[PDB]
Amino acid sequence: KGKTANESRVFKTSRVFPTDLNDHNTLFGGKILSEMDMVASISASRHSRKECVTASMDWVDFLHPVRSSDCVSYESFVIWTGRTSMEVFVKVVSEYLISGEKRIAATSFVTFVALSKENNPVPVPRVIPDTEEEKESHRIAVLRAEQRHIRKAESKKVATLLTF
Amino acid sequence: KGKTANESRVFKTSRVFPTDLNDHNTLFGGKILSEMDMVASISASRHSRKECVTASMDWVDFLHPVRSSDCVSYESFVIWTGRTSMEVFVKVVSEYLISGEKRIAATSFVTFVALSKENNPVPVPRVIPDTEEEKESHRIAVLRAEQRHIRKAESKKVATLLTF
Amino acid sequence: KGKTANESRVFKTSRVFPTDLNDHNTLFGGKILSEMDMVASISASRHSRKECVTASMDWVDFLHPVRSSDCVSYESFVIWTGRTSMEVFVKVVSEYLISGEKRIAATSFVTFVALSKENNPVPVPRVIPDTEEEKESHRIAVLRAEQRHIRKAESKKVATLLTF
Amino acid sequence: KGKTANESRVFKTSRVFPTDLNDHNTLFGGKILSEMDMVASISASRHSRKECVTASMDWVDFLHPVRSSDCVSYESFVIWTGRTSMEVFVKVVSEYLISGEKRIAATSFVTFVALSKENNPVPVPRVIPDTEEEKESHRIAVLRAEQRHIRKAESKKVATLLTF
């Protein structure tokens, strides 16, 4: 059938623990990436109701730092779907505990592929964008889903050229 | 002044813990993304001898699943430098315990920027690619750095349209 | 200077990891308890915009199991205030991965107290219930608070007769 | 077939790590709650010699702060039994590192239910209070149990009026 983007929306707001802070009192980029993928993998399975796997991560720019005085929240939902794969948009917002001042520290698209119990890609519902914002994000996702093939190709190129 | 690429090479092999396996008995991409950033940040500070901050992560294609029957290894090192930014390359290899066979699970570049105590971009030594493979990876790190301005324009755009 | 209950509302959806499961593939009650306080503390500072300390945890009944086949969601918000304290409501929703089925696995009230950098209870804004659900939860909260002095006197006595 | 309360007694002393401290260098209540259930579940299986599921957590008052300057100790034991359930008592003692000073930081009753591999409540041995402390805690437990059906009916109703 077909599912609304909001059917797969996932929210997660966390505290900023010292473990994840580097020397400059800002999160390690990895912490954010690990979390983006995590919250997105949940969106992937909510939409597909299948056991998903992460195929790719779109480039990510860390627009602002997220410090200990901050608070991070992630939001994610599926916006674009292929036959077997789906693109999950992820939004990361930091919030000052005393000010309330929020600001988006990073965003990205994570691609997931639904698999059968025997590693066979499996059809996935279609997404249907409601909000005006969701429609814009879907347009962007459409364009990002086109370069996907070039990227993969470049990735396979670097691989073969490499030593283990 | 000048610093060999290998003078910042960083290794790391770990087992695959159940904690990080999805419902398909494979690693969450997030786990790998975090390790790539982690290991890469060490390379960055080893080279700059200033503690660094991750500025952005390049696109990442998860070429092969990493299972509990494997163990992952991460290799990373600087292969490009600007004034205060460094392009760090990272490769991920999966190794089958009993068979002994390896596979590049993924690769990428993570851009780090060196900062002062007062959080200001500070100069960083130039990197000197020795090996043929290093030269080729540097040849590529260059193309990536050349597109960093448009990649950022793409991100700043999405952030702009987002409402939170 | 009166905040709407929704201004302190906090969400979090997580997967159910093996580490938090006993031999019945059900979460340890403790895991849920920990996440309730966490999520409720973020609500407390969202609303008080001060760092908060948890004063007491209302009694908690684990109505249903939370298996590896589910994902857990936590929702919380300030629903009652005194002078320097807040009663934060928290609801735990268990959702079935492949079937989309949901149930409340538990609910509770966590009481937080705002403190100054000198460990002194500081005044906190008043909370305003909007929806019917919020108005109802508020009454339940009013009742809970009407008896906290008793609960505490009971706790103090037990500590009294204890040899450590 | 009647076990002494002491046969299920469990101890644990831990340091206070930065990760579990809020901005007041006091433990998150949740951390303590988690450790109480953990330690109490080990007592439950020590006594029932079956894998146990946590049914409910009695109300909990955090009488004192637990700072990084302390170490926490947890003690627990079965102090009441029904047919298939047990009420496990738990006391949290905070001890000052350089001064040796101790205080009860919290106490509580955690209720566990023994289950068969088919998720069925199984009979558990009867517990025998020995010391005066144990006999007293037992009476308090008897009272707690006399009202659990009410507490649960109250929890079920809240879940009822909740929209998720």
Place this chain on the structure above:
Amino acid sequence: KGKTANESRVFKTSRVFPTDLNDHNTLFGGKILSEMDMVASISASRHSRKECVTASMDWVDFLHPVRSSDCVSYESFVIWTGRTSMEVFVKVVSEYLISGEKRIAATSFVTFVALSKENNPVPVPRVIPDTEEEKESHRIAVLRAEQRHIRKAESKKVATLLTF
């Protein structure tokens, strides 16, 4: 002055989590070692009431495996003291959750040195063994404290001979 060995006794019983189990369903030796040192460092500070550091680990033999069906408990206390250092005995016992069958999986002595806020070794109370068992363990500790110097010496020898 002088303190009884029991003044520093520390108990800790834990569950065996999957994360720490290797491929053969037995704990990684590291998990046990990390824990022995941990519980022992607590004994060290309880006795010395000083901030301690771990100087050495005596060899450790893993007599039996500790599986998921097991339960581990550590016990530690100071038995031998120098002027500035102290030897902490550590006992590790696994217990079958269904049988109750206990057995000691490993034991060892960990040496700690009390330090002043400026890294200067600092005098430590004297230990006084009460139990007959404690007296035997103290005799053994006395002999182990003699070879300490040879060991250290061999350690320094291997170090200098090594490449970084």
Place this chain on the structure above:
Amino acid sequence: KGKTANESRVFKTSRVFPTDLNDHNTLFGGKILSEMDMVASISASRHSRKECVTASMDWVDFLHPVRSSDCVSYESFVIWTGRTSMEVFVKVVSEYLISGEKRIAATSFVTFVALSKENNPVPVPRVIPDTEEEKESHRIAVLRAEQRHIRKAESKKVATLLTF
């Protein structure tokens, strides 16, 4: 048949997280002990291609503190073999971030034994020391293996006298 030592060499560099720092801003010995075992177990299975179990750990002298201002690196590899047991050598190097200077923080040997699915010691390839340094470390691993029988008699004794 035959396998080079380096064919099992394993590297690993990590940052020093606050979680593992004692009250003296230095690593808990336990943290290091765990990493030495971890890294060494990988070396063991890389060599034997059978998953291994840690049999014993050699004495360990903590020659230098490892601070938050450093980052630790672990190198390990097999340098001695018996029929089914392997002597794995492990070195720990601390590296000062800003200065760039290194120090051997500790070193040791960890004995691993290869097991079948049915938990039976299974034969393991011989190890071939190449480098001069390897030969010297093997020359030593031999002396250690020669005393393993008395080291075990010492441990079995302590276990015998212990009452639990």
